[PDB]
Amino acid sequence: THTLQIEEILELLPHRFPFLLVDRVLDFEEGRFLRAVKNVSVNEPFFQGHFPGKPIFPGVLILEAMAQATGILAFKSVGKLEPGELYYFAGIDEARFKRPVVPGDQMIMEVTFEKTRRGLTRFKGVALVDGKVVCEATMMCARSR
Amino acid sequence: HTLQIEEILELLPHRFPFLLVDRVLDFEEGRFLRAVKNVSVNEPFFQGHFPGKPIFPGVLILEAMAQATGILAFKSVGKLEPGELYYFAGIDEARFKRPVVPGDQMIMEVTFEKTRRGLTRFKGVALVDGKVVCEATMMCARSR
Amino acid sequence: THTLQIEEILELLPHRFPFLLVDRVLDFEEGRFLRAVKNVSVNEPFFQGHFPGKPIFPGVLILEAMAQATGILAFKSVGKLEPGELYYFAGIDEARFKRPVVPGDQMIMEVTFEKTRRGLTRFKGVALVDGKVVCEATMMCARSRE
Amino acid sequence: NTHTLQIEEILELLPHRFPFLLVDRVLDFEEGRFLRAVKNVSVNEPFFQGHFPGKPIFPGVLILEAMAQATGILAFKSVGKLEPGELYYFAGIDEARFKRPVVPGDQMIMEVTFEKTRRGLTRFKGVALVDGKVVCEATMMCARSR
Amino acid sequence: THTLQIEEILELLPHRFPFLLVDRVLDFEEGRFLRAVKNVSVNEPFFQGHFPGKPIFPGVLILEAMAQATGILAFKSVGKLEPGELYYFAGIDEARFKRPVVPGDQMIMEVTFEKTRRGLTRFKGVALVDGKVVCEATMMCARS
Amino acid sequence: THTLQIEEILELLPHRFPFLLVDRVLDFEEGRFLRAVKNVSVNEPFFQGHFPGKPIFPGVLILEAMAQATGILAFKSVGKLEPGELYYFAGIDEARFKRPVVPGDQMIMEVTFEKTRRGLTRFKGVALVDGKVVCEATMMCARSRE
Amino acid sequence: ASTIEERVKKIIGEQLGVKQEEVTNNASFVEDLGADSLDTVELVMALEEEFDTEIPDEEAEKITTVQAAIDYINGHQ
Amino acid sequence: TIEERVKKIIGEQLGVKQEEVTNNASFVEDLGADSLDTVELVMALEEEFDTEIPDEEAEKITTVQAAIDYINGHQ
Amino acid sequence: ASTIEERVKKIIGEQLGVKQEEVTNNASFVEDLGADSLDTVELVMALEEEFDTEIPDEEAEKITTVQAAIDYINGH
Amino acid sequence: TIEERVKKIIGEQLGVKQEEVTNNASFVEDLGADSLDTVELVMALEEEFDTEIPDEEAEKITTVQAAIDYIN
Amino acid sequence: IEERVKKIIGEQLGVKQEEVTNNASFVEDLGADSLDTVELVMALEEEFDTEIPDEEAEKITTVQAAIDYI
Amino acid sequence: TIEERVKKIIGEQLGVKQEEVTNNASFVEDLGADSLDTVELVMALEEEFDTEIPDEEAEKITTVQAAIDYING
């Protein structure tokens, strides 16, 4: 098991507060999969804005956390970002939000590589909380410029 | 007819920093809505997503479009009565085609497709200076 | 167990962002103890200020989280907060920081009632991560109106 | 045709960062003469949660700050950029009038025109417009010194 | 004494975080003058953006702070703010910034009523730090 | 005297917004004591979360401020923080909160060294507002490389 | 050539990712088939668009098995 | 006299040359004053001619001649 | 009737914002018409919606010119 | 060995030297006592002697002598 | 003429015409910082549409010197 | 008496059961010592028994018996 703490993540991803959404990496295999953890706390800034009073983690941020997880997986499988290279969310497909995620929840994500063609990469993402599937999506991310 | 930010505040429950509709330019109940998101560098996420190269995150384009469909629904089928939530249920065929940068005025057009048992399918297109920057098919639900 | 989710906590505590530090209540027995959970994420605002680059949860915020847990226990044991009423830190004794708490950690706090007199109440707190103790303190909290 | 500046060039010219960077784009400019800039007014800006919550209106003093930063860009492009140990100060304001409220959704177009400069101190006239209608006008003095 | 703590100020002004800039009122004579205090700390949000590394209180915020003090004085002299009522900044004349204000400073603002016509009211403001004038301006505020 | 403005404080302490809680150093004597000032403003972020409507400076933040003041005194007495060196909160022993600290207050903190052994330092802290003691504690802070 | 309930069974198999052998007239969407609360609504809409028929919300609540879908489609009611 | 001073005040308030300010040209329509220029100019008249103008009386002063007539009336 | 080639060239011009006159049979999407990595994906999906079909990934990788799309739609 | 322990407790709780803790010293006036030192001191007496002190009874312990007398 | 010069000095340094004498220095007497002198060089120049070099402007520190240069 | 209080302090300061604190338990070896628990423990002893321990004297306390022996002086 190849875990990554928050210092290694900070060295791999450029995102910073308030848009860094991967707290830990439980395991990963180059070119195959990565499992990461997002701790959901009520002390996060978006919780004062999305439906104030009934705190529920927004689904689009679940998708962003999965996209950052694939970003880690890609930087570990291919090189990290060379000067000028950016890592883009290019598309989303077949995404379903199945169960609401609330503060106190620990969301475990598994992203797995499907197909690649010149920097364009399709992934499958699944997010779970306490053994129940909470979200599933197909994503495509590109490296460019 | 237009809606300024006060009327938007009365319709949507979202507040800072997650209210992402600045104005409503036109709309028709049960058919379509055109809204505006002004992208400024003075937004909080810009200090976090790629510091130094400010680019509007694509998932935030999706969230802005879902809030626009929320306004359309509240005007078409009725406002949120107390104890109702308006949920993001699904996304299909989303494409991010052009990056959106500070200074850009993003015009969103959401078009109502179908409704069945509180689930509503919309098609959203976001444009900057008349060129399509994003397009998606979304499904939002009302419940509880 | 008697669990409490975030909505019930919000209705018991007056604290809001960025100083609400109890995410969930796992169990409690009235007048004896309370067990709560603080989820530590990197997306919390103080992490951009306290040692930028080396995210470690500040110990004084562990203390505040325990104090808020004692607040829930007290509100469930003696009575909820009346409008003009405050719940405040009167004193701290024997506070020991044993292990750094980092993003990704799920900090479980257990607060235990000891003694009460004149509205002043003594609690003992323990904060654990993965069964290992990271913090422990003795607190004295008071409630008074205005 | 036209001489624009994107947000990357603005970041290299101005030192201001979130939440006090208030120029989103430069539409045109002629060195040492005038500069036309754009501030997008969005509800997702931090001051809107504090100044009159419920009736969001862009503060007038922030229009003045926006004009000062547009003038800073013009000055750094016409004379040297800010060297280490140089500050860019607001020195004074004369005849500032706020004529129309600025609200979210508005795109405020600012045009600053240099009048006179001597010894690093510069007087300019600024005008801010929304939909071709003037919302603000001021005469300001900014100085660069060490 | 006619002092005002932060609770009375919250009752008088609608401004909230992060744009309320009056921490205390030391004295005032209704319809004549008001003396207030702004405490300058490094733990304020604008300091992370305006010249990061060189913390200096922005002058436009000195002007806003004096304008808020004039709001307090006006609400105490003419009457509190009714619901359908705004307090607008209309103009600035002869504003001079004489000395920079840094964290650690306790800025004393003194605003004095000059003239009124219609809804407009002209005030003269001076800001001091350690007895030295750091700023002075003439302001005009309008009601509803 | 031995006063320190905010620029030198920034060079000494690694803390940043929103967790830098020392605004100025009025005086100090190396290896003995240090006098610092924290200006309490309503424009600080935590006041929107901790008891919204009744602004009162949180006591655990008084403790963090005293800890940062000892950090300044230690870095001036034994040497600045070298690369890879951290300054840890090790313990608290008898913190007492005697008076609430409110916006408009200028909190004067005095830290006095008691003992130092293997980079761990015991100090006594006193916080005063208008000459009245508002808080007092005995704390221990450590310097360590990992 | 022509087909009748075959189309309903085809759509249910496509929507819930199951091989057509698993689709039985007496299969419930939730219990027998791996369907959540949201796939059911997507499925009613998919049926509605395929047979260009209207299924009211009160009517849609009753379609919980393959047989119920086939029966409602027969005769648009 | 009184017309030089009134015309100087109006010309300075609405940035116009003394030549363009005739006696019966209205501030709003002819000279371009805005809801705030009218008030500032009334205060300016009060400051120059040590007289006080009630709110309704200020409402009627829309031309140079109207101001001169008010000033000569309330000596 | 509308020829398969009419339909395909119509779609490619709409998707890639190119004049219908410039879309020739041997035009490569990437070089000749300047399409990026995601224009190819949208372009295949547009073909799928147009002719009511599904194009597997193995075949989709082969559609890189106008002629390839027409050929795919009408039998080798 | 009662008053030795009682005075020991008072000296420990109220940071005063054992010579300054006389039989007739009041906590508030003579010694320096916080409104919270009285409560901590009552709790400390109970913890040392494992006894129960009612609130009305505890309010009467304002001097060293009163504490020793309640103990006996 | 000097009436206009004294008007300019009074407006620039917020002092009554009664207190601005011919031999009053700008820096100490009328309390002017580094920016009142430059603002006044600019105001004088704009009033008398004249060009004053900085080295020439540096010497003008009293009302007397100002009109004399004028 | 004195050993009751010393063992109580050592047990509270270091997270060990009072059963494991024998007279000759070494702080570093037998009990769980972080890089600075010994310093924390000496300071704890000092605050409880209101004594002052010089640095050379403090450096000598490495076992429970050494602590009990010092408290007699």
Ligand SMILES: */C(=C/S(=O)(=O)CCCNC(=O)CCNC(=O)[C@H](O)C(C)(C)CO[PH](*)(O)O)CCC
């Ligand atoms: C705020 C947040 S959000 O839109 O992003 C919602 C976050 C993700 N949404 C969900 O969690 C939907 C979960 N789905 C449900 O729980 C529904 O009740 C379902 C499963 C669809 C219905 O099942 P059936 O039992 O009715 C708002 C942003 C606009």
Ligand SMILES: */C(=C/S(=O)(=O)CCCNC(=O)CCNC(=O)[C@H](O)C(C)(C)CO[PH](*)(O)O)CCC
């Ligand atoms: C950030 C802040 S700010 O510059 O806008 C606010 C600073 C305002 N305060 C000052 O300008 C200090 C005034 N100092 C002076 O002008 C002194 O008189 C000078 C001219 C510097 C020295 O005079 P002389 O002794 O040389 C910037 C945002 C754009």
Ligand SMILES: */C(=C/S(=O)(=O)CCCNC(=O)CCNC(=O)[C@H](O)C(C)(C)CO[PH](*)(O)O)CCC
């Ligand atoms: C919060 C913000 S602010 O007031 O400082 C910023 C508002 C800027 N000022 C204005 O918006 C005034 C613009 N509008 C006007 O000028 C009035 O409509 C006028 C013209 C004055 C009305 O006169 P006439 O039209 O009757 C508030 C903090 C204090």
Ligand SMILES: */C(=C/S(=O)(=O)CCCNC(=O)CCNC(=O)[C@H](O)C(C)(C)CO[PH](*)(O)O)CCC
């Ligand atoms: C930021 C945070 S903090 O100082 O408050 C630290 C939070 C609480 N402190 C701790 O977690 C201390 C943990 N203790 C240890 O890790 C070891 O006992 C130490 C002291 C590190 C000794 O290690 P050894 O290997 O040298 C800053 C606030 C000022």
Ligand SMILES: */C(=C/S(=O)(=O)CCCNC(=O)CCNC(=O)[C@H](O)C(C)(C)CO[PH](*)(O)O)CCC
């Ligand atoms: C928010 C934070 S906080 O709990 O940290 C507040 C900390 C500030 N604490 C105090 O101000 C304690 C003040 N102490 C008292 O006044 C007590 O009532 C004492 C001193 C014990 C009086 O004793 P006696 O008269 O009963 C929460 C802020 C509400």
Ligand SMILES: */C(=C/S(=O)(=O)CCCNC(=O)CCNC(=O)[C@H](O)C(C)(C)CO[PH](*)(O)O)CCC
């Ligand atoms: C941070 C931001 S983001 O990824 O969300 C960017 C916002 C959406 N992304 C885009 O705008 C991508 C649009 N640009 C493109 O389409 C690329 O140039 C394409 C064409 C996809 C490259 O294709 P091929 O050249 O590889 C990231 C947070 C994860």
